[PDB]
Structure formats: structure tokens, C-alpha cells
Design a protein around this motif. Structure first.
Motif, PDB file in Angstrom:
ATOM      1  N   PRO A  22       0.816  -1.218   0.000  1.00  0.00           N
ATOM      2  CA  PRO A  22       0.000   0.000   0.000  1.00  0.00           C
ATOM      3  C   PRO A  22       0.849   1.266   0.000  1.00  0.00           C
ATOM      4  CG  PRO A  22       0.033  -0.970   2.187  1.00  0.00           C
ATOM      5  CD  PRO A  22       0.734  -1.943   1.279  1.00  0.00           C
ATOM      6  N   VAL A  23       0.643   2.112  -1.004  1.00  0.00           N
ATOM      7  CA  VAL A  23       1.388   3.360  -1.119  1.00  0.00           C
ATOM      8  C   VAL A  23       0.489   4.495  -1.595  1.00  0.00           C
ATOM      9  CG1 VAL A  23       3.283   4.553  -2.266  1.00  0.00           C
ATOM     10  CG2 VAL A  23       3.542   2.153  -1.596  1.00  0.00           C
ATOM     11  N   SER A  24       0.490   5.596  -0.849  1.00  0.00           N
ATOM     12  CA  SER A  24      -0.329   6.753  -1.192  1.00  0.00           C
ATOM     13  C   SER A  24       0.007   7.259  -2.592  1.00  0.00           C
ATOM     14  CB  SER A  24      -0.123   7.871  -0.169  1.00  0.00           C
ATOM     15  OG  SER A  24      -0.683   7.525   1.085  1.00  0.00           O
ATOM     16  N   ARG A  25      -1.022   7.663  -3.331  1.00  0.00           N
ATOM     17  CA  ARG A  25      -0.837   8.168  -4.686  1.00  0.00           C
ATOM     18  C   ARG A  25       0.395   9.063  -4.769  1.00  0.00           C
ATOM     19  NH1 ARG A  25      -3.373  11.855  -8.352  1.00  0.00           N
ATOM     20  NH2 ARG A  25      -4.058  13.295  -6.702  1.00  0.00           N
ATOM     21  N   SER A  26       0.486  10.023  -3.855  1.00  0.00           N
ATOM     22  CA  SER A  26       1.612  10.948  -3.828  1.00  0.00           C
ATOM     23  C   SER A  26       2.920  10.205  -3.574  1.00  0.00           C
ATOM     24  CB  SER A  26       1.400  12.014  -2.750  1.00  0.00           C
ATOM     25  OG  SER A  26       2.475  12.934  -2.722  1.00  0.00           O
ATOM     26  N   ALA A  27       2.924   9.361  -2.546  1.00  0.00           N
ATOM     27  CA  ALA A  27       4.109   8.588  -2.196  1.00  0.00           C
ATOM     28  C   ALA A  27       4.764   7.995  -3.440  1.00  0.00           C
ATOM     29  CB  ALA A  27       3.748   7.486  -1.211  1.00  0.00           C
ATOM     30  N   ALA A  28       3.947   7.421  -4.317  1.00  0.00           N
ATOM     31  CA  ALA A  28       4.447   6.819  -5.547  1.00  0.00           C
ATOM     32  C   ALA A  28       5.169   7.848  -6.408  1.00  0.00           C
ATOM     33  CB  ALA A  28       3.305   6.183  -6.326  1.00  0.00           C
ATOM     34  N   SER A  33      10.622  10.059  -8.050  1.00  0.00           N
ATOM     35  CA  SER A  33      11.574  11.142  -8.266  1.00  0.00           C
ATOM     36  C   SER A  33      12.978  10.726  -7.836  1.00  0.00           C
ATOM     37  CB  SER A  33      11.142  12.391  -7.495  1.00  0.00           C
ATOM     38  OG  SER A  33      12.086  13.437  -7.648  1.00  0.00           O
ATOM     39  N   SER A  34      13.048   9.775  -6.910  1.00  0.00           N
ATOM     40  CA  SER A  34      14.329   9.290  -6.408  1.00  0.00           C
ATOM     41  C   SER A  34      14.820   8.104  -7.234  1.00  0.00           C
ATOM     42  CB  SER A  34      14.205   8.887  -4.938  1.00  0.00           C
ATOM     43  OG  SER A  34      15.425   8.355  -4.451  1.00  0.00           O
ATOM     44  N   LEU A  35      14.540   8.138  -8.531  1.00  0.00           N
ATOM     45  CA  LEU A  35      14.953   7.066  -9.432  1.00  0.00           C
ATOM     46  C   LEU A  35      15.158   7.594 -10.848  1.00  0.00           C
ATOM     47  CD1 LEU A  35      12.260   4.581  -8.137  1.00  0.00           C
ATOM     48  CD2 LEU A  35      14.703   4.398  -7.634  1.00  0.00           C
ATOM     49  N   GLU A  44      -0.855   0.157  -3.957  1.00  0.00           N
ATOM     50  CA  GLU A  44      -2.176  -0.382  -3.654  1.00  0.00           C
ATOM     51  C   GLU A  44      -2.973   0.586  -2.783  1.00  0.00           C
ATOM     52  OE1 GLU A  44      -2.021  -4.555  -2.620  1.00  0.00           O
ATOM     53  OE2 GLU A  44      -4.058  -4.465  -1.804  1.00  0.00           O
ATOM     54  N   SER A  45      -4.190   0.898  -3.215  1.00  0.00           N
ATOM     55  CA  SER A  45      -5.052   1.815  -2.479  1.00  0.00           C
ATOM     56  C   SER A  45      -5.727   1.104  -1.310  1.00  0.00           C
ATOM     57  CB  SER A  45      -6.110   2.412  -3.408  1.00  0.00           C
ATOM     58  OG  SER A  45      -6.853   3.425  -2.752  1.00  0.00           O
ATOM     59  N   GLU A  46      -6.064   1.869  -0.276  1.00  0.00           N
ATOM     60  CA  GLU A  46      -6.715   1.313   0.905  1.00  0.00           C
ATOM     61  C   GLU A  46      -8.233   1.380   0.770  1.00  0.00           C
ATOM     62  OE1 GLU A  46      -5.649   1.667   5.663  1.00  0.00           O
ATOM     63  OE2 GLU A  46      -7.067   3.047   4.704  1.00  0.00           O
ATOM     64  N   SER A  55       2.292   2.630 -11.810  1.00  0.00           N
ATOM     65  CA  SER A  55       2.714   3.987 -12.143  1.00  0.00           C
ATOM     66  C   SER A  55       4.221   4.045 -12.378  1.00  0.00           C
ATOM     67  CB  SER A  55       2.325   4.953 -11.023  1.00  0.00           C
ATOM     68  OG  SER A  55       0.973   5.362 -11.148  1.00  0.00           O
ATOM     69  N   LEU A  56       4.612   4.111 -13.646  1.00  0.00           N
ATOM     70  CA  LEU A  56       6.024   4.171 -14.008  1.00  0.00           C
ATOM     71  C   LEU A  56       6.411   5.575 -14.461  1.00  0.00           C
ATOM     72  CD1 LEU A  56       7.420   4.605 -16.854  1.00  0.00           C
ATOM     73  CD2 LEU A  56       6.185   2.541 -17.542  1.00  0.00           C
ATOM     74  N   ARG A  57       7.554   6.052 -13.979  1.00  0.00           N
ATOM     75  CA  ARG A  57       8.036   7.381 -14.335  1.00  0.00           C
ATOM     76  C   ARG A  57       8.759   7.355 -15.679  1.00  0.00           C
ATOM     77  NH1 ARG A  57       7.774  12.758 -11.945  1.00  0.00           N
ATOM     78  NH2 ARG A  57       9.788  13.812 -12.260  1.00  0.00           N
ATOM     79  N   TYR A  58       8.538   8.388 -16.485  1.00  0.00           N
ATOM     80  CA  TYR A  58       9.165   8.481 -17.797  1.00  0.00           C
ATOM     81  C   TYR A  58       9.126   9.914 -18.319  1.00  0.00           C
ATOM     82  CZ  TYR A  58      10.314   7.460 -22.663  1.00  0.00           C
ATOM     83  OH  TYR A  58      10.907   7.433 -23.905  1.00  0.00           O
ATOM     84  N   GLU A  59      10.285  10.422 -18.725  1.00  0.00           N
ATOM     85  CA  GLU A  59      10.385  11.781 -19.245  1.00  0.00           C
ATOM     86  C   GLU A  59       9.716  12.775 -18.300  1.00  0.00           C
ATOM     87  OE1 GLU A  59       8.914  12.785 -23.416  1.00  0.00           O
ATOM     88  OE2 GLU A  59       8.682  14.651 -22.278  1.00  0.00           O
ATOM     89  N   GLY A  60       9.912  12.570 -17.000  1.00  0.00           N
ATOM     90  CA  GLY A  60       9.322  13.455 -16.014  1.00  0.00           C
ATOM     91  C   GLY A  60       7.808  13.369 -15.989  1.00  0.00           C
ATOM     92  N   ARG A  61       7.283  12.160 -16.155  1.00  0.00           N
ATOM     93  CA  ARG A  61       5.841  11.946 -16.155  1.00  0.00           C
ATOM     94  C   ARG A  61       5.490  10.604 -15.519  1.00  0.00           C
ATOM     95  NH1 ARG A  61       6.507  14.582 -20.685  1.00  0.00           N
ATOM     96  NH2 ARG A  61       5.321  16.482 -21.180  1.00  0.00           N
TER      97      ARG A  61
END
Length: 119
Positions: A22-28, A33-35, A44-46, A55-61
Motif C-alpha cells: 500500500p502506497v499513497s498516490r503521492s508517495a508513488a 523522483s528518487s529514481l 495499492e489503495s486502501e 505507475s512508471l516514471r518516464y520523461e518526467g511523467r
């Protein structure tokens, strides 16, 4: 210098590298950003009962992929084909995007395959 890592007696069911319980939308978004610009995690939402999301990061998105569900109970985020379980969803994709934004290569840092015992 930065150190900190000790074994805990508490049992957990978070083995997969990408899987981060479980990870808060923001947390993700933040953590991402640290990758590098090619990391993918599974939060996972509660609120909602068993609600996963890739949610995968790509080109700052951050590309969100709300895993769908079939009448039976399968998971697949695409309109080309379907998958039996999640493991296959990320595993298969890892090789080819097949629709996704990219090919899941870097699920999570400090990836560990062999760990301690717990039950």
C-alpha cells in the motif's frame, strides 16, 4: 554517508521488486523522483478493496495503469490481449510494452531475490 538496514521479525508479503504494498498516490510519484527515468512501481489503495495500479516514471511523467478485472477475476491493462495473473502482466510486459508506455525493466531499487524466512 547514509546507512540503515536491519532485519525485522514482522512478517510481510511484499517480495516482488516492483510490488510496494500500500502506497499513497503521492508517495508513488514522489518516490519515483528518487529514481531514473525508467522505473515502475505497483502501489495499492486502501479505500477501494484490493485496488492496484502501475505507475512508471518516464520523461518526467507518471503513467497510471489502472488494472482492469474480468468477469472471472483476471488482470490485464491493454486492449490487445489479456493475462491470467498480475505476475504475468508485469513479467510479459517487462519484455515488450505491448501498449504500455515502455517495457517494465526497473521495477524497484535494491532489488533482493533471496531474503530471510518468515511465516
Amino acid at each position: 554517508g547514509s546507512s540503515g538496514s536491519s532485519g525485522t521479525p514482522v512478517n510481510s508479503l511484499e517480495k516482488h521488486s516492483w510490488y510496494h504494498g500500500p502506497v499513497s498516490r503521492s508517495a508513488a510519484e514522489y518516490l519515483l523522483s528518487s529514481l531514473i527515468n525508467g522505473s515502475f512501481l505497483v502501489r495499492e489503495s486502501e479505500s477501494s478493496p484490493g485496488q492496484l495500479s502501475i505507475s512508471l516514471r518516464y520523461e518526467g511523467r507518471v503513467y497510471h495503469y489502472r488494472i482492469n478485472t474480468t468477469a472471472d477475476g483476471k488482470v490485464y491493462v491493454t486492449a490487445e490481449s489479456r493475462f491470467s495473473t498480475l505476475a504475468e502482466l508485469v513479467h510479459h510486459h517487462s519484455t515488450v510494452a505491448d501498449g504500455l508506455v515502455t517495457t517494465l525493466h526497473y521495477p524497484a531499487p535494491k532489488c533482493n531475490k533471496s531474503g530471510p524466512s518468515s511465516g
